[PDB]
Amino acid sequence: NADDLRDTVTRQIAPLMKQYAIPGMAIGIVADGKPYVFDYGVMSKQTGKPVTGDTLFEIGSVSKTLTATLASDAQEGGELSLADPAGKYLPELQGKPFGVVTLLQLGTHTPGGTRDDAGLIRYLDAWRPAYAPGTHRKYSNVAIGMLGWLTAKAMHQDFATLMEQRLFPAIGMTHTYINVPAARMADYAQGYTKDGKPVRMTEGMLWQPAYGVRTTAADLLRFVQANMGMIHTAPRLQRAIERTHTGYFRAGPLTQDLIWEQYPYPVALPTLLAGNAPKMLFDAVPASAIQPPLAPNPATWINKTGSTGGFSTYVAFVPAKRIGIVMLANGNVPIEERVKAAYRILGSL
């Protein structure tokens, strides 16, 4: 099994790492609910240390799936409503265009366009949208950056504390960090730009909610299992996790959940390519609200991409089929090439 399974992965990942010169990758597979992690290559070109079970990768915007889960949990406990306006938690913004943006619009990339906290409030005050809220989908770290900020306000806690002392241990993610600890800096892989220059993360404002997660393939895989209800999460978090699969908007070929993005399953490859295409990532796509929102639906392909300066991430799973993939690379891999490999690999199962 693991032999056949590893061969299936290797036939995709080895040429990928070859053509794009990725020093290392960690691949997580759920095959009929069984998890597997397959490590390839090295953590750092200067130290040649190999990718192992504890190697940390930056997952970029896949971080936002965990932020969305936290916000969904707050909603489940009555601490917030996704329909709440930002101005509810930032009273100064009442009267300002951003004060009416809802938490839902931040978690769906539809708010209407895009140092210290006083300056952040200064930035949000002067912010003038290009579109009315909830009508156009436009990828942005300010939207989900603010989703995590506002959820922490509602939950009466520091953001990073909520992630490391609440969410991560409740999934049993024991090698997942917003702030990587000193004893763990040795596990942190080195990223590499498209040139080959080594790089790790620059931490702007709202850096933790939007892209602050470093993690292992095993831990991200366990999250994927939790998103298919497989690992005995407590009832409030389990409901919270499933509710992030609610379908809120159509945007071209893509359906926008809370941060997650989904497609009907079975899914044709052109559907995934079009939904993960650069046009989705950079343009302001008209987004039509789904009324009533789609209930979470096991017969879907649910995925999310992540890209930092030095790392490439992809996550995709099908709850009805009980399969999923996690791909972590410490180099730059074209999004559509992550998509194609996942589609071929998962099609093998």
CATH class for the region spanning 1-349: alpha beta
343 tagged catalytic = no
Domain boundaries, the chain: 1-349
DSSP string, 92-108: GGTTSGGGG-BHHHHHT
Longest pairwise C-alpha distance within the chain = 61
Q: Are strands 300-307 and 261-264 parallel, antiparallel or unpaired?
A: antiparallel
Measured between alpha carbons, how far is 137 from 153 in angstroms, rounded to an integer? 25
Task: Burial-class residue 81 by CB neighbours within 10 Å (0-12, 13-18, 19+).
Answer: middle
Catalytic option among 44, 61, 63, 307: 61
For residue 299 the two structure tokens come to 């017969």
139 tagged catalytic = yes
Catalytic option among 20, 36, 131, 139: 139
Q: Peptide bond before 35: cis, by omega within 30 degrees of 0?
A: no
Percentages of the chain per state (helix, strand, coil), in multiples of 5: 40, 20, 35
Elucidation method: X-ray
